[PDB]
Design a protein around this nucleic acid. Sequence first.
RNA 1: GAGUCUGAACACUCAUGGUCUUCGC
RNA 2: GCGAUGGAACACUCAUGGUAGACUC
RNA 3: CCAUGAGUGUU
RNA 4: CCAUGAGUGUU
Lengths: 375, 375, 230, 231
Amino acid sequence: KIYLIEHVIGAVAYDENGNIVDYITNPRDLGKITEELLNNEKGIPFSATVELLKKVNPQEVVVENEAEVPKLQALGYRVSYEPYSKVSRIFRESLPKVAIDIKFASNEEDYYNFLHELSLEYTRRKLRSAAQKRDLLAIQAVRAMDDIDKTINLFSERLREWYSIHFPELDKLIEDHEEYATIVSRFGDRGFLTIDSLKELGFNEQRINRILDAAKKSIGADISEDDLSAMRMIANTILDLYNIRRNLNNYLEGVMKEVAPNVTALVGPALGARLLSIAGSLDELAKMPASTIQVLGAEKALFRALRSGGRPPKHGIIFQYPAIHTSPRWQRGKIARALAAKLAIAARVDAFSGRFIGDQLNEQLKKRIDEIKEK
Amino acid sequence: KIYLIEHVIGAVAYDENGNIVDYITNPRDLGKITEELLNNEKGIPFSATVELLKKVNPQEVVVENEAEVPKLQALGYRVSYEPYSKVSRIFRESLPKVAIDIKFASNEEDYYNFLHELSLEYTRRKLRSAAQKRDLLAIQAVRAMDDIDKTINLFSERLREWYSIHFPELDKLIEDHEEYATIVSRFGDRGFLTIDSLKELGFNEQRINRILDAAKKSIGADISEDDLSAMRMIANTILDLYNIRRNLNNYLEGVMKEVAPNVTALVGPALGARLLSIAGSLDELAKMPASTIQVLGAEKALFRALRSGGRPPKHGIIFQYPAIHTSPRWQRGKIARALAAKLAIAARVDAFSGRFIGDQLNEQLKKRIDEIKEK
Amino acid sequence: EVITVKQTNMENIYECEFNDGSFRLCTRNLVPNFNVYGERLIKYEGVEYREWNAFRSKLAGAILKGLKTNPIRKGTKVLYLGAASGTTISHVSDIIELNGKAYGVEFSPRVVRELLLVAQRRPNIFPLLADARFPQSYKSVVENVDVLYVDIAQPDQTDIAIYNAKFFLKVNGDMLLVIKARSIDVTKDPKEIYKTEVEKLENSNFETIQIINLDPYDKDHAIVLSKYKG
Amino acid sequence: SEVITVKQTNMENIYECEFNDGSFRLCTRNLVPNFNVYGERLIKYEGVEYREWNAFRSKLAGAILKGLKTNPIRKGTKVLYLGAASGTTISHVSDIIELNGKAYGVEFSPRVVRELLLVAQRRPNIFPLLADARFPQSYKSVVENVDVLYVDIAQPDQTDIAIYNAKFFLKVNGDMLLVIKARSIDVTKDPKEIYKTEVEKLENSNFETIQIINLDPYDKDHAIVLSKYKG
RNA sequence: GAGUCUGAACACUCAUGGUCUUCGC
RNA sequence: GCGAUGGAACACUCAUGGUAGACUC
RNA sequence: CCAUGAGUGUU
RNA sequence: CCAUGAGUGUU
Ligand SMILES: Nc1ncnc2c1ncn2[C@@H]1O[C@H](CSCC[C@H](N)C(=O)O)[C@@H](O)[C@H]1O
Ligand SMILES: Nc1ncnc2c1ncn2[C@@H]1O[C@H](CSCC[C@H](N)C(=O)O)[C@@H](O)[C@H]1O
């Protein structure tokens, strides 16, 4: 009976054949119209639409946005939805002129000048809202934390080669990078090593014995203090990086408990945030089926196999989940499919703000993994 | 006519048919024998050999190591060199018994016990001498500097993405990573930016007003102080890394002016050390032809073009030389060939400690470059 | 250095000869002294032109591979799906001039952040941070257009294009559709994909006009020109 | 995985271990009980410790799996090992030849000999020589002549280096095990052509060809040739 | 559209080789 | 072997899409 | 880049 | 991994 048109222009009521029945023009306010476009996206009718229908008292209203149908029905109207109707094309083909007739704009230039500021303002607001989503902070943080891990390993490999020129035996004696960098930072010249100074740093007596024995037998070269100091710059940097790594990990814990507590209950904050990073957002993660979640991070292996026909990957980044990588190869598929199943549930509960069930998801999984290990 | 055998066990004089004319047995001293073995590979005869030849008064002496011929001649003997002589094979096939006959050892087990300790001490002293080479230090330092460069860039790219959540327009306004990191470190919330604080850091008025204007109108999100502090941890690490980079580059200048001054005169300490790093050592670098030096660092393109017949690379890491990478592509080949040719000469001057001609090599090269560009 | 700039066979698309022998496509700059993506600004007989890199712009590539007729001309109204950071739509804005209109749809906020810089200086460009699958989310801003230009990485890109045409493309208007084969099905041969997607179009009442392979300007890409019959 | 049994094979002091997963793996008797070299598994069976021998990391184990008919490395054997690297394969050679055998290990990269030195410190069997195989006049003052010359060096002229070391140190009628590394000789050529060219050079230097074994898949672009030195 | 089952997660460091074409002497 | 000439230096960041095989309902 | 040897990090 | 868009470092 009546076709409702909602546009920057205002609200316009049309017949079956395209004749304007009546209209209410929007104010020429950028703030007001953007707010109403944002509202209208979640189905809220323009306030100009509410005044229009109250005046036109229509028998049946055809709208163009499906989410708007319940909103108008709750006002007491008979409402149907119609996509790309003939009438709304007829309306769109009569712009910019119809904006002059209904007196939103004085001429074509005036109309398009306003429309241009409108699109900018609309876009700026949708950019601000996207930037407010707090899952972006978890994602950047865990990406930075992974950069730091990689850097710690890169610099520690370099320091071991560089310092082994002066004390090569230490490399194989100290497996822990942070301890190795501690020894190089604190002492430099292997001649400065002693029981008390090593004890003071927290080494136990057997370890201290192996170290002082190696330092005394050492086949390494004699280098200068300046040479040692170039090496200690790397060691100190490594120590600083571990401190940042631990801060970032504590930061990430608080954000992930806030942003995705159910996922965090299952996999912890770091691995939870890596799932977000690869998905791109919590909302994206919560659309994925378990079988996609299962291989997030394995895109190289998956597409290599999808081409060559070779063997597909059993797991992506969730391989970091201890019960996956510390179990035998033949159990890993099944465990990864059990975890992916609970991740998919946890992500939906988090994305829709459902009630926290993460601890129960964990129990269900631990017990399901127990079933599997009987293999 | 005498075949001189020099072995761990001592000096043996053989006649042409494998019969022992006389011998002088080394002392059972690991340190002494090891030192005499090291001198000997350089052609210096054993002290036992000197004693032996005076006893035997040979008419002619056949030696196993060619480097030894001039040294024994300087003692007044007629001397020749024979590779893998029959007599020396007869000596070696009579071990370990001959070691018992000349009373170097009581029995087989005694001989091999000592031989084993000898081989360890010999190998230990060569490992020490290898580690003492000064070019190892330049190679490690420039490698750590390149990790640092890579890391600075990786963290800066991450910081920009991260801080852009809060202040997105700053990314395109501040192109230098150290300045971007400086702004994030110092202020955090873009609200804290004032004219005079920015002046303090050295920015100029035109830039400062663009920054403050962008911060007022920013569509970035509002985030907590704790969210900003996580970002600032990456910023301050970036600034520490730039300081390390500069200290390392100053260290590398000292080492390279001492280790390869002629190479350093042509390409600077950092690029010169990269050449050492890819070649593996100054000695290896000085064996290479110009055409190989020209493409050090481009092994990927080189072997791709060998295996496919494609176009080979015109330059490797020397692409970093400003006259190459700031020049039009049709000149780079000629320019790189001219530089590689001077580097080959320079590497040999440094490796064999000739007189410094780096200033002159550089003058020759820059004249050749002027000729090329004026085609 | 610039020998000469003369208009090519297509309205408001120019060609510049350089003294080193080179030839490059260019458009008259709507915003003099400002570049969009680091392209060269060319001055000739008073007028400033922007060189139009065909290795970065599918429309420039299509022209250098033999695009016969170009529906994008002066005063054209364009719905641009996949506006991205502004590279191609900035040249579209040059060609169409102040009385044409380019509605730019792009759903990635990270890249619309850059597109907004381009749009701010061009009263020609209306950026819409929106999902092309849902034309109901920007029908309130746009109008009906002469040209629908679609370059979105989606597996149902052709269906999305068709859906926007039913909303917004005038009958007898034109569609330029980029077919991104590795984004439709990476396992299939692009030649098959092109055949399949054009079949869709002709089944949806789009008269095929010309199909252009974009190699070497783009690997595994084609671009289709069709007239929408209604 | 659990060991069913370990039985001696055709070749002396080389054993084959059986696992209940139906898989078999070569192993040797550990000359130094309770120590590993490169993380290999220590296997206890009927009171004797064995070391699993991974054919993917050892050319000699791989050759046995790919059908080596006779093995000159037995107990008491004297061997010159060119290319001893960090000690993987030579540690097993050490187990096979036992305390009365001798393995002289030549390796010229100091970075890797740092590691070889640790293997040798525990094995009186093994005499590590940081030395260039092109310069046998260096280590002639330490070694002796040998029954087996084992050569695994990445050098374009590895075969000529093997032949030249043989004239110094390999007994007449002794044996040479020469790994042919096709990609370190010439990446542009087909490995099968490399092998015929290298074997031809050996036969031209009075080496009698006993067996030529292609080492795929334990090592790609690799052959190994067992030859008898005629003098 | 669900389900079960099968099933190649990523990121890196060091060491040794393999270094073109053409045209001239 | 020498020369001239020809000639694809490397290291990375973000955004969009492409997500398997069997069997069961 | 290819082949070979030895290792590291997310663990 | 592939294709596409935008960029950074050694400079
Ligand atoms: N459903 C969708 N709605 C809007 N944009 C989409 C989309 N799906 C993909 N895109 C966008 O399509 C773009 C493909 S890149 C296209 C480049 C652009 N046409 C130019 O002129 O240079 C990406 O920016 C991507 O974010
Ligand atoms: N000229 C030479 N002299 C001594 N060793 C050499 C050499 N040329 C190459 N090599 C060494 O040969 C080795 C090849 S890797 C060999 C691995 C070892 N044989 C094993 O199976 O465990 C490298 O360590 C290399 O340093």
